[PDB]
Amino acid sequence: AMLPVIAIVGRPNVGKSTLFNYLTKSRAALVADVPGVTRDRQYGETTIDSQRLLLVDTGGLVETQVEQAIDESDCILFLVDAKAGLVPADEIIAERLRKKGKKIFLAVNKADRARAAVVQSDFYKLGFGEPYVIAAASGRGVKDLMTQVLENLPEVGIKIAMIGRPNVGKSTLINRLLGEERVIVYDSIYIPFARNDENYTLIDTAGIRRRAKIQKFSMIKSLQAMHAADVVIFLLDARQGVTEQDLRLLNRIVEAGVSLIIAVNKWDGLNIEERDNVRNAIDRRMPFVDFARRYFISALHGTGVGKLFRAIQESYQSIQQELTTGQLTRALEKAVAEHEPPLVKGRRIRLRYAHLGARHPLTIVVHGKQTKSLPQSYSRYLANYFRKTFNFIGVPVHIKLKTDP
Ligand SMILES: Nc1nc2c(ncn2[C@@H]2O[C@H](COP(=O)(O)OP(=O)(O)O)[C@@H](O)[C@H]2O)c(=O)[nH]1
Ligand SMILES: Nc1nc2c(ncn2[C@@H]2O[C@H](COP(=O)(O)OP(=O)(O)O)[C@@H](O)[C@H]2O)c(=O)[nH]1
């Protein structure tokens, strides 16, 4: 079940980023034990009728990248502007879209409170069927549009995926893992395997096990793998150090909420200073992923690779454990007893209970009075307290405050 990908396309200033923001998951109410993740303006996820969808704002990519996004998407949401009417640049985009071989949903944005007949008039001639009436500023028509997008769509064990930039060692590591002691192997995107009584499925969205067998980076296919997997193994290339692009990928993993293990690959042959330099770079540039187990390996020579299986099992178990309101509240009471919340404007903040908001991203909701006066430093203290109490690894703990009712 790979998530469908919807590419938002259209001229500048039609409302693509506004619609993207309306549809995607907001993380404004969350405070993490360690900050360091921003809101992605290119890729996101949305949910409509329980069906999760990947969204790409092609305006955030700006033509090579835009063309790649369109070619790798399942459907296309093409936005035009009711206030402008049909303009020549819309027609240029339309002709390009017709040559691709995919569904085009036409959406007329900025409809505001104008009648549909007025809004849609200029756009029937584009030949993309119904010009869906929307206003991204108010939500008008958005649910109806997304319902039409949905309607026009076609033992696993622990699912894992390798994520990383080109040439970091993904195919090498896949081949090495599948050949480790006691591993047995038996559409082509899923590769089931087992080790002892442990069942796994490798997710290979870019088909790299096949290219290695016989012989272009896709952020979309990386995101699809990340959302399909239970645990991600992110590979760094120790010879290159920590790169800006590595950080962009890691951030997306953390934002997606998926369990993470870091494999620092190509560790072989490095001297004491080289190794210490890589370690120091990780500590300086990646403290936001301290919750993730990391292993220094050589996929090529096999050194340290076997440690990954227990890391997969333990990371999965950590986020899958039972987390009742009673046990979360028991932990909250203990945290408060050890370190009392500060008085704010002279009034005491009273924290009453905690419940599980979500496992991905891990969100613990803390209820009380005057909770929004809680300094962010206290929220970070609570995040760390829950982390230690339940031994959360592979995912960061987020605290969401709620001042009931
Ligand atoms: N009146 C109106 N303005 C909108 C609507 N949606 C977006 N806008 C505005 O149109 C402008 C362009 O929007 P933006 O999302 O940046 O367009 P993009 O360049 O396609 O990403 C911004 O000022 C938005 O606030 C809408 O439904 N109605
Ligand atoms: N020295 C060394 N080279 C490696 C290691 N892992 C992969 N490589 C090399 O790095 C290159 C890219 O490996 P590959 O698995 O194709 O990377 P992918 O693009 O991430 O799938 C190849 O030349 C590999 O032999 C390693 O652990 N040590």
Secondary structure (DSSP) of 37-106: ----SSEEEEEETTEEEEEEEGGGT--HHHHHHHHH-SEEEEEEETTT-S-HHHHHHHHHHHHSSSEEEE
Minimum-distance ligand to the CA of 163?
2
390, two tokens: 């339940």
Chain breaks in the chain (C to N over 2.5 A) after: 62, 154, 186, 215
Answer whether 233's CB lies under 8 Å from 162's CB: yes
The distance from CA 320 to its chain's CA centroid, rounded to whole angstroms, is: 18
- Ligand 1 centre to CA of 209 (Å) is 43
Amino acid at 106: L
Give nearest CA residue, ligand 2 atom 11: 167
Nearest CA to ligand 1 atom 10: 15
Task: For residue 405, say if its preceding peptide bond is cis, omega within 30 degrees of 0.
Answer: yes
Whether 161 and 205 have beta carbons less than 8 Å apart is answered as yes
C-beta separation of 252 from 361 below 8 A:
no
The residue whose CA has the least distance to atom 9 of ligand 2 is 169
C-alpha–C-alpha distance, residues 148 and 141, integer Å: 11
| Residue pair 204/218 in contact by the 8 Å Cβ criterion | no
For ligand 2, is residue 222 a contact (CB within 6 Å)? no
Cβ-defined contacts of 219-224 (< 8 Å, 24+): 219/42, 219/43, 219/252, 220/5, 220/43, 220/54, 220/56, 220/68, 220/69, 220/72, 220/73, 221/72, 222/163, 222/249, 222/252, 223/3, 223/43, 223/54, 223/252, 223/256, 224/2, 224/3, 224/5, 224/54
- Residue 247: partners with Cβ closer than 8 Å, 6 or more residues away: 285, 286
Give the residue carrying structure tokens 């986020």: 319
Q: Is the CB of 85 under 6 A from ligand 2?
A: no
Residues of the chain by 3-state class (helix, strand, coil), percent to 5: 40, 25, 35
Pairing mode, if any, of strands 362-369 and 350-359? antiparallel
Query: Across the strands, what pairs with 344?
Result: 347
User: Which mutation among 9, 13, 57, 140 tests ligand 1's pocket best, with the greatest number of atoms within 8 A of CB?
Assistant: 13
Beta-carbon contacts of residue 52 (< 8 Å; ≥ 6 apart): 3, 45, 46, 227
Of the bound ligands, which one is closest to the alpha carbon of residue 79?
A: 1
Cis omega (within 30 of 0) on the bond before 361? Answer: yes
Is any atom of ligand 2 closer than 6 Å to the C-beta of 176? Answer: no
DSSP states along 163-222: E-STTSSHHHHHHHHTTSTTEEE--TTEEEEEETTEEEEEE-TT-HHHHHHH----HHHH
Residues 6+ apart with CB under 8 A from 327: none
Beta carbon of 170 within 6 Å of any ligand 2 atom: yes
Residue 85 half-sphere exposure toward CB, CA atoms < 13 A:
4
Spell out the long-range contacts of 174-178 with Cβ–Cβ below 8 A and sequence spacing 24 or more: 174/202, 174/204, 174/208, 174/209, 174/212, 175/209, 175/212, 176/299, 176/300, 176/302, 176/305, 177/305, 177/308, 178/202
> Which structure tokens are listed for 149?
């997008």
Give resolution in angstroms: 1.8
Site of tokens 């599980």: 356
Distance in angstroms (rounded) separating the CA atoms of residues 1 and 224: 10
Look at the block and give the residue holding tokens 């949903």.
105
| Ligand 1 mean position, distance from CA 223 (Å) | 27
Technique used to solve these coordinates:
X-ray
Could you give all domains of the chain from N- to C-terminal order, each with its CATH number? 18-152 (3.40.50.300), 158-320 (3.40.50.300), 329-401 (3.30.300.20)
State whether the beta carbon of 11 lies less than 6 angstroms from ligand 1: no
* Cα 163 to middle of ligand 1, angstroms: 34
State how far the Cα of 8 lies from the Cα of 87, in Å rounded to an integer.
18
Per-residue HEC secondary structure of 355-384 comes to EEEEECCEEEEEEEECHHHCCHHHHHHHHH
| Beta-strand relationship, 132-133 and 103-109 | parallel
Ligand 2 site, residue 268, Cβ cutoff 6 A: yes
d(CA 59, CA 61): 5
Residue 176 in contact with ligand 1 by CB distance below 6 A: no
Q: Ligand 2: which residue has its CA nearest to atom 14?
A: 169
Provide the 10 A C-beta neighbour count for residue 114: 16
Q: Is the CB of 139 under 6 A from ligand 2?
A: no
Q: How many CB atoms are closer than 10 A to CB 176?
A: 20
Distance CA 250, CA 288 (A): 9
The one-letter amino acid code at 236 reads L
298 C-alpha to ligand 2 centroid (Å): 9
Could you say which ligand is closest to the alpha carbon of residue 236? 2
Q: Which atom of ligand 2 is nearest to the CA of 269?
A: 1
Collapsing DSSP to helix, strand or coil, 385 comes out as helix
Partners of 261 in beta bridges: 233, 293
Annotated binding site for GTP: 10-17, 57-61, 109-112, 164-171, 204-208, 265-268
Q: What secondary structure letter does DSSP report for 262?
A: E
3-state class (DSSP) for residue 293? strand
For the stretch 123-147, what's the b/e string if a residue is b when 16 or more beta carbons lie within 10 angstroms of its beta carbon?
Answer: beebebeebbbbbbeeebbbeebbe
In this structure, which ligand is nearest to the CA of 305? 2
| Separation between Cα atoms, residue 349 and residue 369, nearest integer Å | 6
Q: Collect contacts of 179-186 with beta carbons under 8 A, ≥24 apart.
A: 180/302, 180/305, 180/306, 180/309, 181/306
Residue having the nearest C-alpha atom to atom 2 of ligand 2: 266
